Symmetry: C3
Subunit: 143 residues, 3 copies
């Protein structure tokens, strides 16, 4: 009967996640958890911070996930670098694993950096803009 | 041998709970965890905050649990709305699931709102007072 | 098939640990987690704080663990009491379980308290110094 042990384990996990959620330390959406260290740095620096914590730079794949990151962007009053970069072909973006981006939420007219804006930033309203990768942006990670 | 996997899992849970406890993010009493977002709002707002985090507005059922919530009330220097409301019959209170309240810690003379004070607040010394549900009170949740 | 349940459980644990790590609430090194409440008190007080959180006053047993505690000492700009005390024989130190200390990182010339410095403090560079147990030092716990 590890079930009773499994019940206790599940209970305690919900407790810790409950505490972190209640205190605004993270946002849970489906099986994904978003969180920020509150720091504003560039793309490469964000990537390192997220991977060091055992996670990855956040990327929304659903409207719900997009709205979650947006709320964090809104809360900290800063744009957010997302986990995707531009191919050699302008207008085409891929996740960091190489896969083609599916869900998008570009601000009207974007992307239009003409291949000179490799990264993607999220505005506080949740819409996307392709941008240079060297700006100071809120570090948001997914786990 | 999932036991060794279960040992690692139990260890990591204790670590995270240990960290949260050490930094005062929550209080553990038996199988119950209490926590606050530090905010002072009304009863309905507290209920929503707690349920959104996957928990419930706190309610003590033992002296130990009561003292835990009291310490939080004391720390934040504010009274706490508890998870119970008054029936149609004055003087009789029930938990939010409908069940009759068992453990009580009324301040001497309370409850005496004559049915016009549906909610229950905890003083910083841990004693209870029946009160209106529209005041600004420290949000404390249980998980 | 508790495996799928075990996968979910492992995932959620990594999420919570990821959040705590990302926000600097703790440092993970191997199977050990270090954390501080930011408070500066004496040896006996630290011991109580750590055990109350279900952990123990930190003690490094590897260079990696030592560097982790050092970074915390460096961050909070304060020396750290470590989990060991001196025997009746000067120069010989033991962990709190009684076992003889193995890994050491004494500052050159230390320990030289001549048996009048029972405790051990860590400098911000990570090196050790034997010291009296009544000073105000950063409380760092391991879990
Ligand atoms: Ca653009
Ligand atoms: Ca009253
Ligand atoms: Ca010395």
């Amino acid at each position: 009967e590890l079930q009773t042990e499994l019940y206790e384990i599940k209970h305690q996990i919900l407790q810790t996640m409950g505490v972190l959620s209640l205190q605004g330390s993270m946002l849970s959406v489906g099986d994904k958890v978003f969180s920020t260290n509150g720091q504003s740095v560039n793309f490469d620096t964000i990537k390192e911070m997220c991977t060091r914590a055992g996670g990855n730079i956040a990327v929304p794949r659903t409207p719900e996930e997009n709205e979650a990151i947006a709320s964090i962007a809104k809360k900290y009053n800063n744009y957010v670098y997302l986990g995707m970069i531009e191919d050699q072909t302008p207008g085409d973006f891929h996740y960091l694993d190489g896969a083609s981006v599916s869900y998008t939420n570009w601000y009207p007219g974007e992307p239009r950096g003409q291949g000179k804006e490799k990264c993607v930033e999220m505005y506080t309203d949740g819409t996307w803009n392709d941008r240079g990768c060297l700006q100071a942006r809120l570090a948001v990670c997914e786990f």
